[PDB]
Amino acid sequence: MHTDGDKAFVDFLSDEIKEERKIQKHKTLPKMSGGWELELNGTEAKLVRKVAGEKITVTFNINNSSTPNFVVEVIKNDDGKKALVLDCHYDIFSIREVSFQSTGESEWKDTNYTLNTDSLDWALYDHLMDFLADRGVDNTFADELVELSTALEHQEYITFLEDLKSFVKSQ
Amino acid sequence: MHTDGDKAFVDFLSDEIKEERKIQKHKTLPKMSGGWELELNGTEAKLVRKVAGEKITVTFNINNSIPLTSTPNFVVEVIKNDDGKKALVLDCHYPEDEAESDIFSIREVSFQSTGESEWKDTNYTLNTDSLDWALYDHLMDFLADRGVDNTFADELVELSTALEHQEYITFLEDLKSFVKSQ
Amino acid sequence: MHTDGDKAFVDFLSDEIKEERKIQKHKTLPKMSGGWELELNGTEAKLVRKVAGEKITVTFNINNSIELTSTPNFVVEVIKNDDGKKALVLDCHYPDIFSIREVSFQSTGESEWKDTNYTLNTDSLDWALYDHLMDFLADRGVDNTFADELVELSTALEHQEYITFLEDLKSFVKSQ
């Protein structure tokens, strides 16, 4: 179908898309420094950084986030099939869960001991924060991830409006 | 094992079932306008409807749908025949008589591939919380033009409620059979 | 790599670990009375019991179950030998001592939960059926004494696995 409502919808989308793009004529993905490389898979983003004997990965999804929860994976080259995984949330940025997981695991193994920080020693919590900082994951990184996630969100929103326009226009 | 406790349990169920069947046996089962067909599988219900160039499907599960009355979240899937590869998916729900009040609201919208393994997490999903009001209104109109309006949402509550009762009765029957054996 | 922060983290962990062991080592893994057989799968524990004509299993995971006391939600499955394909499943938790949150039949041995099966939520349920269900559990070994011993067992497990985790963490941070 292609009702009158659908046609008014399309005109509305044409206008909104025009305005959104106007607000995006002088804007590009806020690059982050520190050796990080960005990889995108739909709404899932991954930041990868290599250091002496280690590989650090930060994953986040922009859906319903823009301050997206992010997962930090630290892999020491000694044992490349194992990694320390820290689930972080947004008082600026905090570690919510910590556990060891198998690298490139097809899924998540909920049978691996998972430390919840809700009931955790303050000293242990702080060392974990220090551990992440030594590897480039600190407040600055977190502030910059928010800016990036927000920018990715607005561009995917625009893409979405266009997909919606084509859809409502079809048939 | 068949204990004294099990016999008392079976005694309770036999008469609960009968009482249940008697009561709910008056609603004559709610009928819905629009020409929708109910395709049920256990607790998962699908209301299907077709119009020029499109297939409209509304899916909801009666489990954990009670906040007596069933008000389940429901997913609307609109498929344009010229591209049955994907569909526009709208996750709706009933807000926990203002002129500006709707029986239901849209919480999320996204494009998904038809008959996909499961909700693709890497697909853009638009949350309606801080959504532009005119865009939201258009989404509601889009749904309405396909039969998913406040009357529909009202009838859905009637249907889901009747389904809840009917499956509750069947549950007691399976339970009675379970406890009665051995 | 191995930084100064890492070094201080490892030393901290060594002390942390000695303290936990010093506090723990004084009691053995508490036993469950009633003939239950314990099986471990990482943080997942399964207690199995066989009674006349049926098998009863109780499963729980020490993760997110909280000296720190562990009171995990546990799932009871009752399998009749007269129909081993279906199982009555009761999800329980600690708010008497424990309560039933939901009940439903599931396929025995299934690899994933089947959301198309009618699931009864006790929140919206008469108290008559609820009591019969609690009695059904009691007749099969899942009574108040069970739940109390389950807490001790889960607490002893969570503590031992917490220690093992710290040892793992220490070794990992010591690496490179």
Curated annotation (Swiss-Prot), chain A:
S-S pairs: none
Effect recorded for F93L: In COXPD33; uncertain significance
Upregulation: Enhanced cell surface expression upon platelet and monocyte activation.
Residues the record lists as N6-acetyllysine modifications: K18
Cellular localisation: Mitochondrion matrix; Nucleus; Nucleus, Nucleolus; Cell membrane
Keywords: Acetylation, Adaptive immunity, Apoptosis, Cell membrane, Complement pathway, Cytoplasm, Disease variant, DNA damage, Host-virus interaction, Immunity, Innate immunity, Membrane, Mitochondrion, mRNA processing, mRNA splicing, Nucleus, Phosphoprotein, Primary mitochondrial disease, Ribosome biogenesis, Secreted, Transcription, Transcription regulation, Transit peptide
Effect noted on mutating L164F: In COXPD33; uncertain significance
Tissue specificity statement from the Swiss-Prot or TrEMBL entry: Expressed on cell surface of peripheral blood cells (at protein level); Surface expression is reported for macrophages and monocyte-derived dendritic cells.
GO cellular component, one term: mitochondrial matrix
UniProt topology in membrane: Peripheral membrane protein
Job description of the protein: Multifunctional and multicompartmental protein involved in inflammation and infection processes, ribosome biogenesis, protein synthesis in mitochondria, regulation of apoptosis, transcriptional regulation and pre-mRNA splicing. At the cell surface is thought to act as an endothelial receptor for plasma proteins of the complement and kallikrein-kinin cascades. Putative receptor for C1q; specifically binds to the globular 'heads' of C1q thus inhibiting C1; may perform the receptor function through a complex with C1qR/CD93.
Family, as annotated: Belongs to the MAM33 family.
Full protein name: Complement component 1 Q subcomponent-binding protein, mitochondrial
First-to-last residue of the parent protein present: 74 to 282 of 282
Curated annotation (Swiss-Prot), chain B:
Molecular function in Gene Ontology: adrenergic receptor binding; C5-methylcytidine-containing RNA reader activity; complement component C1q complex binding; deoxyribonuclease inhibitor activity; enzyme inhibitor activity; hyaluronic acid binding; kininogen binding; mitochondrial ribosome binding
Span list, region C1q binding: 3-20
N6-acetyllysine: residues bearing it: K18
Top-rank taxon: Eukaryota
Tagged with keyword Glycoprotein: no
Membrane topology, record value: Peripheral membrane protein
Gene Ontology CC terms: cell surface; cytoplasm; cytosol; extracellular space; GABA-ergic synapse; glutamatergic synapse; membrane; mitochondrial matrix
Keyword Secreted: yes
Modified residues (Phosphotyrosine): Y94
Family (UniProt): Belongs to the MAM33 family.
Function noted in UniProt: Multifunctional and multicompartmental protein involved in inflammation and infection processes, ribosome biogenesis, protein synthesis in mitochondria, regulation of apoptosis, transcriptional regulation and pre-mRNA splicing. At the cell surface is thought to act as an endothelial receptor for plasma proteins of the complement and kallikrein-kinin cascades. Putative receptor for C1q; specifically binds to the globular 'heads' of C1q thus inhibiting C1; may perform the receptor function through a complex with C1qR/CD93.
Protein name, as recorded: Complement component 1 Q subcomponent-binding protein, mitochondrial
Organism expressing this protein natively: Homo sapiens
Residues of the full protein shown: 74 to 282 of 282
UniProtKB/Swiss-Prot annotation, chain C:
Domain of life the protein comes from: Eukaryota
Modified residues (Phosphoserine): S14, S99
GO molecular function terms attached to this record: adrenergic receptor binding; C5-methylcytidine-containing RNA reader activity; complement component C1q complex binding; deoxyribonuclease inhibitor activity; enzyme inhibitor activity; hyaluronic acid binding; kininogen binding; mitochondrial ribosome binding
Tissue expression pattern: Expressed on cell surface of peripheral blood cells (at protein level); Surface expression is reported for macrophages and monocyte-derived dendritic cells.
Clinical condition linked: Combined oxidative phosphorylation deficiency 33: An autosomal recessive disorder caused by multiple mitochondrial respiratory chain defects and impaired mitochondrial energy metabolism. Clinical manifestations are highly variable. Affected infants present with cardiomyopathy accompanied by multisystemic features involving liver, kidney, and brain. Death in infancy is observed in some patients. Children and adults present with myopathy and progressive external ophthalmoplegia.
Oligomer status and interactors: Homotrimer; three monomers form a donut-shaped structure with an unusually asymmetric charge distribution on the surface. Interacts with CDK13, HRK, VTN, NFYB, ADRA1B, FOXC1, DDX21, DDX50, NCL, SRSF1, SRSF9 and CDKN2A isoform smARF. Interacts with CD93; the association may represent a cell surface C1q receptor. Interacts with KRT1; the association represents a cell surface kininogen receptor. Interacts with CD209; the interaction is indicative for a C1q:C1QBP:CD209 signaling complex. Interacts with FBL and RRP1; the respective interactions with C1QBP are competitive.
Assigned protein family: Belongs to the MAM33 family.
Name of this protein: Complement component 1 Q subcomponent-binding protein, mitochondrial
Annotated organism of origin: Homo sapiens
